[PDB]
Amino acid sequence: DRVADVIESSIGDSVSRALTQALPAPTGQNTQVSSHRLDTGEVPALQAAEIGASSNTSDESMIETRCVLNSHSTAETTLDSFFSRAGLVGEIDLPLEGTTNPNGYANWDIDITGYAQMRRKVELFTYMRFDAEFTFVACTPTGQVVPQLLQYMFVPPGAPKPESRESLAWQTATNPSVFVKLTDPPAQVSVPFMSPASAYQWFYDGYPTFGEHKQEKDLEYGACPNNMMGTFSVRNVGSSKSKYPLVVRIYMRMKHVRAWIPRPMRNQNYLFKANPNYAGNSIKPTGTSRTAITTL
Amino acid sequence: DRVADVIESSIGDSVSRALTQALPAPTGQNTQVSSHRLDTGEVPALQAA
Amino acid sequence: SDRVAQLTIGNSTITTQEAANIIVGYGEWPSYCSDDDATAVDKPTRPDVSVNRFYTLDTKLWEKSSKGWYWKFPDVLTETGVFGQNAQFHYLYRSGFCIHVQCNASKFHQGALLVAILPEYVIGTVAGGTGTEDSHPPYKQTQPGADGFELQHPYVLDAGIPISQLTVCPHQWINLRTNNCATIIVPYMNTLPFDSALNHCNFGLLVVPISPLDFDQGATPVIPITITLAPMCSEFAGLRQAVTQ
Amino acid sequence: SDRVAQLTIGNSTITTQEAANIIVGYGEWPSYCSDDDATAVDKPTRPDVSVNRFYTLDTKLWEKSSKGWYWKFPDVLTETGVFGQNAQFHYLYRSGFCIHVQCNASKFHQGALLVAILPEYVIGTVAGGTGTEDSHPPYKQTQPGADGFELQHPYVLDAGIPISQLTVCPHQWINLRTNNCATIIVPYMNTLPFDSALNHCNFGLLVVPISPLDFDQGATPVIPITITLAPMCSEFAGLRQAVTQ
Amino acid sequence: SDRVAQLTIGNSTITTQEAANIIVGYGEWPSYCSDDDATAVDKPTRPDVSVNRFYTLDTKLWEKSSKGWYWKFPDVLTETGVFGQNAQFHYLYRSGFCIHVQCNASKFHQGALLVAILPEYVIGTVAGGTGTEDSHPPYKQTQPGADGFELQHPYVLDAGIPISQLTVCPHQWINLRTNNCATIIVPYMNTLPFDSALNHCNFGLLVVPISPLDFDQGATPVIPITITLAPMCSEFAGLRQAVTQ
Ligand SMILES: Cc1cc(CCCCCCCOc2ccc(C3=NCCO3)cc2)on1
DSSP: OOOSHHHHOOTTOOSOOOOOOOOOOSBOOOBOOOOOEEEESOOSSOOOGGGOOOOOOOHHHHSOOOOBOOOOBOGGGSHHHHHOSOEEEEEEEEOSSSSSSOTTEEEEEOOGGGSHHHHHHHTTEEEEEEEEEEEEEEEOTTSOOOOOEEEEEEEOBTBOOOOSTTOGGGGOSSSOEEEEETTSOOEEEEEOOOOSSSSEESOOOBOSSOSOOOSTTGGGTTOOTTSOOOEEEEEESSSSOOSSOEEEEEEEEEEEEEEEEEOOOOOSOOOBTTBOOOOSSOOOOSSOOOSOTTOO | OOOSHHHHOOTTOOSOOOOOOOOOOSSOOOOOOOOOEEEESOOSSOOOO | OOSOEEEEETTEEEEESSOOOOEEGGGOOOOOOOTTTOOOOSOOBOOGGGTSSOEEEEEEEEOTTOOOEEEEHHHHTSSSHHHHHHHHHEEEEEEEEEEEEEOOOOTTOEEEEEEEEEESOOOOOOTTTTSOSOOOOOHHHHOOOTTOEEOSOGGGTTTTSOGGGGGGSSEEEEETTTOSEEEEEEOOOSSSSOBOTTTBOOEEEEEEEEEEEEOOTTSOOOEEEEEEEEEEEEEEEEEOSOOOO | OOSOEEEEETTEEEEESSOOOOEEGGGOOOOOOOTTTOOOOSOOBOOGGGTSSOEEEEEEEEOTTOOOEEEEHHHHTSSSHHHHHHHHHEEEEEEEEEEEEEOOOOTTOEEEEEEEEEESOOOOOOTTTTSOSOOOOOHHHHOOOTTOEEOSOGGGTTTTSOGGGGGGSSEEEEETTTOSEEEEEEOOOSSSSOBOTTTOOOEEEEEEEEEEEEOOTTSOOOEEEEEEEEEEEEEEEEEOSOOOO | OOSOEEEEETTEEEEESSOOOOEEGGGOOOOOOOTTTOOOOSOOBOOGGGTSSOEEEEEEEEOTTOOOEEEEHHHHTSSSHHHHHHHHHEEEEEEEEEEEEEOOOOTTOEEEEEEEEEESOOOOOOTTTTSOSOOOOOHHHHOOOTTOEEOSOGGGTTTTSOGGGGGGSSEEEEETTTOSEEEEEEOOOSSSSOBOTTTOOOEEEEEEEEEEEEOOTTSOOOEEEEEEEEEEEEEEEEEOSOOOO
């Protein structure tokens, strides 16, 4: 009735093999007593890096050890623990005189790869899923607090991006806006994991267009639309000149984090957003350098 | 109450390990019958000084 | 019973007598897409044996001065074989891989290659040297297919990241005094159940000489390195006409 | 599971991948002194890990003409390490040893060293050649400490006894085509429970090339031999000030 | 536990550390003659240990151009040893054999000998070249005893049959990169329970280089091949005076 190779055909197994399990690691591993071992056949110290596995040699088999009850915690090295710390990710200028952002409004493309500290941290992993708490610290360039009313509006990709301080999009009938005086404590808001993918992707090795991929378009290599969350717009709430030069610092703090596929830490300086370019001529070593391997 | 490495610490074992025992040798060892053995894997004649 | 091994998939069988065990990427065997993980409502194609097999794609020559090479993956196998076809006709693709890099020499030769799997391996430019120019790596560099590409600044994996740390990735070494081949088994890894085999490359295969090849003169100097990969649990959906890119 | 081995004592660990089993002197592991075997009424010190460890004391160069060397033992380890100290401060000393002599070469080299433990190894003089003079071996010869001493008439072990029979003593060979190190484990052996580590040497370590070192020219000619010993079950009693000799 | 082996019969013991298992001709150990298989009514002699042992009869030199050699069997062992005697004094003979051909070289040498047992190995002449002359191989060629004989046209085993097929016979190869000796154990094979060891040769031992010996100059060029055979379950009947042929 069947053909056997069809009854066996393990094609369609949705479950992943595994091989490894997750164990409780509340504290560091304890050290149990060790004694001299003079025997042939058992060689812990001998390993083979070629295999591709880290040496599994225990302190106990390398020296006579005492007993130590390690109660040191590992809580501070969790992801939420490590990543859930507010950091600067965006900065916006609203000067009186200038060419940057006059007219009293600004459209900041929501991209957290513009500030080296925060960027390097996350670029530790390839994928990352999480909610976040955005805080907005506004004031004048002197750090002086001023009685001015702003309006921050999150504009999802597709929504009409404001073209002027008095644009119609500021009616914000469905977009979520926040009205704040620069004298009120920094506005703070909770943001869900909004993406069509299951996790944000710091690195996307490929294109999104699907076309020819000529020279003029290599601009899109590495551009993954599942991270383009839209823009953040801000404007002084009025009809006339703001009267004061403003600056908004955007701080993001992740929470409910899930990270996957750890990769090498950024070695060189950063040059552009969403683009791992590096200075070809100024390729500095990862660390410090000595004069000889035989001296400190 | 103790420190473990002290409870184990085999330091102070007055008895010698040994490994070998003394057996009765009143006469020379006897010779038991032998027959041809043509097999791979067992090599008595091969030693390592 | 650990240095010798045989890998058999489809109608292909690889033999090795000096291998150093098998690495299973992130400790997970390649699986098919779950019913609750998928979204594409059309019933997919699972060619099985016609595409899940060992394609021996390329050979490089290791020289006392080689810098290293890489191959982007989803892609490398396109245009070649029935796999290639299903990857061009279908929009959506999904699959794990069994990568077997081999390279032998004599007991009188010496050297050591690092063989890693770097997921989402985005390439970067030298930025015009000074760093003022916002250049971008060309299609010929980001998606070299077979033949791979040679690294220009291996120390930073042409992407500003230390190769010294590349081992946090499924890797294996080919130390000539120890083995003559590496074997990594990567599962499908992406933030999506399926994606276009064409314009997205799930990971790159790195093969870099960390300890330079060397041998007294007179010993055969042609030391090749051959890549042989095999898709596993290949699934395709979203059938249309055939597409190259 | 017999040619590879690891010895771990104190905070020292020796590795070997070509050893030929371990010899246990007179088939007896080193023990501490029994309550009915001892006489010294004071409670002794058993430093354990601070003195029971692997001291890598010396290196000799094996040459196509080397005669052989010896090291008297209790002594060799004085002045060096915490062991040395306890041996100088205390009158009475007691301890077994784990001696590991190592020497490697290539598969293209050849030779064979005899490594023996001769208890109460009394040295003798050539008696002024003719045999009429009653000369005596000097302190520099009978108690050379580390650095050992070179034999002048190995055939008779500079003591009028055939080396051909030296194997009735805990021994092991270092045949280069077979291994690269010897491992003897001698227990404390004296006619007394304790004795002065200073003026009495329980036994000597002999290392003699019976089958001369040889190799075609062009192969590294510097073939060292290194001695590494480790006290076991060290006990000390009779504490006074520190004494050199 | 498969590459090393020891064969012990009578008062002879062969050792080997690179053998490649043992072949048992036609899967049958040598047996004595059944009571219903025999016809000779006289009670036979079964010398056992005095004749069932390892006779190391000959040595040939393998050269980059050697053609190959053969030894007819029942015969090869006559005149040599107590076996020889019982074979001359008795009319009827019966016995199986343990043939051990050995030949070693270095890991830097290369070559491969085919070692087969061809039952009823009848030799043929070149028929005077043209094929018109009905010549016949001489006693010196059909029954060369020890020393064997060298093949003149190995491709056809000097008997018009392809050597390419000689493997349907109990065989074993001596590939120098793999082993250093062959071991075949042939049972008594004839269409009779006993026959004259003198004028009938149950089978021949073939040793032919299929893959030529070769080595870079400077490596010892004298590569011998030694034959060592041992009768098993030897039985003799029909006693008369001693006969040579
Ligand atoms: C009120 C209110 C709240 C806001 C801002 C909401 C911001 C939500 C941002 C979520 C950002 O997730 C990111 C993931 C990836 C990247 C990225 N940049 C380079 C490629 O990856 C940037 C942001 O505006 N107004």
